[PDB]
């Protein structure tokens, strides 16, 4: 199970000029390219070692896509302003994501595409990849063009054919790094949290991919979890915690499940 | 249907022309294409509402295109040059897959307007030989000496424009083929039943709309001012 | 990028199969068909990606390997005489058309019982009579130009008196020369 998702953001700036537009591309949990107008290179560029040997034709094309997407979104920001009857003075956000998924078998599992105005769903491509879901009275007017157009068709064509073809190519290009599983380095901390109480924090460090299951169990179970965070070197880190009776730590064992571990690992607090 | 204006245009090198296009109402996408002399139809510009999306085909600084209103679009050549001479096709699209094209503005930029001439037009009556041999009478009409090749020919029987039993040349003949700045000629045939030609004294008219100077453009030349105008020739049916 | 025959002929009534080559196409490149009837606006016919497509006008047949395509006009008419452009359009946010040379399709009328003849029409305001008409010849005959340049000969032109259900091929010739005359007019017509 692998993915090729991109995340496009456009933000209007009534003070300054043209909206700020940013694209980022991810193979699974690894970013590999990005585009940013209001930047030295008004161009798509690599963001992973293994993309640095793609030819000029690749970058010249993928730049044209990003720049064109930005120009259309420039219009969309002003369109949706009209729809919702908002003033020029206010700054608004428009986000577009799209992703395909491969199965174990290596074939297309699923594809999805949504855009959101001001951090709330606007228009959504449904599971069947042929019909849109409009959140709002306004989104229906947009949808009316998207339906009548058969954007559905064009986006299905990307998600089913192009997206998976290129996901495959990237998985091979960056196979050394991407298709490698790094398991978590696991340890257990302890902090008084008073006299009668005590904390037990179970750490998992340096694991790719970011999907992981930390669970705190006692013999015969209310755990605090924190958003898995980026290490800043491809790998990730996460911790789960539990408040236990002071001096009864040894009843409590941490269970770490990762794709890159032979068998799920079990921890206890080091005396 | 997409609307364009004007249908024809003839200007002097250095002068300023502006083409208009009204897209199918609702269509977010408006395109300009053109076919300059020699080459095929080529893409100029693509508008997504009022905003330009692709300018990649716009020749130079002399060509300026605007669609501020986000509806109809202008295209201003300033100053107009010889090489610009071609057909300019506008198009609109809802989906960006099917592009609906207009009838096209036909633009001829001319070094000196003093070589523009309108057509002389004669109707030639059916051959008595044909009428007996077949049971039919082909009229031929001939428009000659016109420049540039901006003519539309139509056959009128009494007061109504005929379509059935007509056919006109697509391309006009050049008269003096070798020479450039050569005036053109154009022929058409209207075939009718022998009886229809000979029996009633039915009125046959060959109308040729020519596009030349508007009243604005100065002249000074001792002959008449070429001007856009309808030259026509007539023929009455004959029992004798 | 897309290569077709320069010109193709079809007897009206029978289907017109317009071939097109595009070996260098990708999976994100659709095959579009437009046409142009004389020099008026280009007209969208049909398009497709991989599977076969039929619509009101025509059918598009793309090969499995997707390198070759055929446009099918099911029953060709004199209207269908036009230039047929086969254009590849990579899925983009403009989808601009690049126009190739294109196949020029002649829809041959079929004159089952011809009777070629040359007649001479008299002018209204006359003594010049200055015109010859070569008419009712089969469409498979070709009309040369004079190579005199003192004489003018037109391209052959199909004509349809539809109510009466009749079609005649026609070619006009005239000369402002001292030594004028028809029959010699269309010298060099098969």
């Amino acid at each position: 199970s692998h993915s090729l998702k991109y995340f496009h953001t456009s933000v209007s700036r009534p003070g300054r000029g043209e909206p700020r537009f940013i694209s980022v591309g991810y193979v699974d949990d690894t970013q590999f390219v990005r585009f940013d107008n209001d930047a030295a290179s008004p161009r798509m560029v690599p963001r992973a070692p293994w993309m640095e040997q793609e030819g000029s034709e690749y970058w010249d094309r993928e730049t044209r896509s990003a720049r064109d997407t930005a120009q259309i979104f420039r219009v969309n920001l002003r369109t949706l302003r009209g729809y919702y009857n908002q003033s020029e003075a206010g700054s608004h956000t428009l986000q577009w994501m799209h992703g395909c998924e491969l199965g174990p078998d290596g074939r297309f599992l699923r594809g999805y595409e949504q855009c959101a105005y001001d951090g709330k769903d606007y228009l959504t491509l449904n599971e069947d990849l042929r019909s849109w879901t409009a959140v709002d009275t306004a989104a229906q007017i947009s949808e009316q063009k998207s339906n009548d157009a058969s954007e559905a068709e064009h986006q299905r064509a990307y998600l089913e054919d192009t997206c998976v073809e290129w996901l495959h190519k990237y998985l091979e290009k960056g196979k050394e790094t991407l298709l490698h599983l790094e398991p978590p380095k696991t340890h257990v901390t302890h902090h008084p949290i008073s006299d009668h109480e005590a904390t037990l924090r179970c750490w998992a460090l340096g694991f790719y991919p970011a999907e992981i299951t930390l669970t705190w169990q006692q013999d015969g179970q209310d755990t605090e979890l924190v958003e898995t965070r980026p290490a800043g070197d491809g790998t990730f880190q996460k911790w789960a915690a539990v408040v236990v009776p002071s001096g009864e730590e040894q009843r409590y064992t941490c269970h770490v499940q990762h794709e890159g571990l032979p068998e799920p690992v079990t921890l206890r607090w080091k005396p | 249907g997409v609307t364009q204006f004007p249908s024809h245009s003839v200007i002097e090198k250095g002068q300023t022309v502006t083409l208009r296009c009204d897209p199918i109402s609702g269509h977010d996408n408006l395109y300009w294409y053109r076919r300059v002399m020699g080459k095929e139809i080529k893409f100029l510009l693509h508008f997504v509402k009022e905003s330009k999306q692709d300018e990649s085909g716009m020749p130079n600084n002399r060509f300026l295109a605007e669609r501020t209103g986000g509806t109809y679009s202008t295209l201003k050549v300033q100053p107009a040059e010889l090489e610009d001479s071609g057909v300019y096709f506008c198009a609109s699209s809802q989906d960006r897959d099917t592009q609906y094209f207009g009838p096209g503005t036909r633009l001829t930029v001319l070094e000196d307007l003093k070589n523009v001439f309108p057509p002389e037009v004669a109707v030639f009556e059916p051959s008595e030989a044909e009428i007996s041999h077949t049971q039919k009478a082909t009229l031929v009409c001939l428009a000659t000496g016109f420049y540039p090749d901006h003519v539309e020919l139509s056959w009128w029987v009494n007061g109504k424009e005929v379509h059935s039993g007509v056919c006109t040349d697509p391309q006009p003949l050049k008269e003096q083929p070798a020479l450039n700045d050569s005036r053109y000629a154009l022929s058409s045939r209207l075939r009718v039943s022998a009886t229809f030609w000979q029996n009633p004294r039915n009125h046959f008219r060959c109308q040729v709309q020519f596009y030349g100077l508007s009243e604005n453009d100065e002249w000074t030349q001792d002959r008449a001012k070429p001007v856009t105008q309808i030259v026509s020739a007539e023929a009455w049916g004959r029992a004798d | 990028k897309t290569t077709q025959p320069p010109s193709m002929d079809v007897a009206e009534g029978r289907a017109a199969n317009l071939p097109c080559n595009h070996s260098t196409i990708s999976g994100n490149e659709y095959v579009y068909w437009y046409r142009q009837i004389h020099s008026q606006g280009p007209q969208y016919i049909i398009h497709g990606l991989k599977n076969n497509e039929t619509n009101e006008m025509a059918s598009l047949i793309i090969t499995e390997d997707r390198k070759s395509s055929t446009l099918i006009l099911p029953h060709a008419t004199l209207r269908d005489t036009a230039v047929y452009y086969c254009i590849v359009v990579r899925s983009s946010n403009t989808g601009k058309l690049i126009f190739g040379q294109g196949t020029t399709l002649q829809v041959k009328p079929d004159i089952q019982n011809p009777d070629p003849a040359v007649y001479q029409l008299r002018d209204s305001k006359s003594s010049d009579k200055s015109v010859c008409l070569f008419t009712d010849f089969d469409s498979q005959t070709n009309v040369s130009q004079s190579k005199d340049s003192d004489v003018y000969i037109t391209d052959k032109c199909v004509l349809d008196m539809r109510s009466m259900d009749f079609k005649s091929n026609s070619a006009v010739a005239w000369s402002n020369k001292s030594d004028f005359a028809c029959a010699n007019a269309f010298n060099n017509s098969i």
Partner: peptide, 9 residues
């Protein structure tokens, strides 16, 4: 490779 065509709303 990102989506080469995007929605006009």
């Amino acid at each position: 490779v990102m989506a080469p065509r995007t929605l006009i709303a």
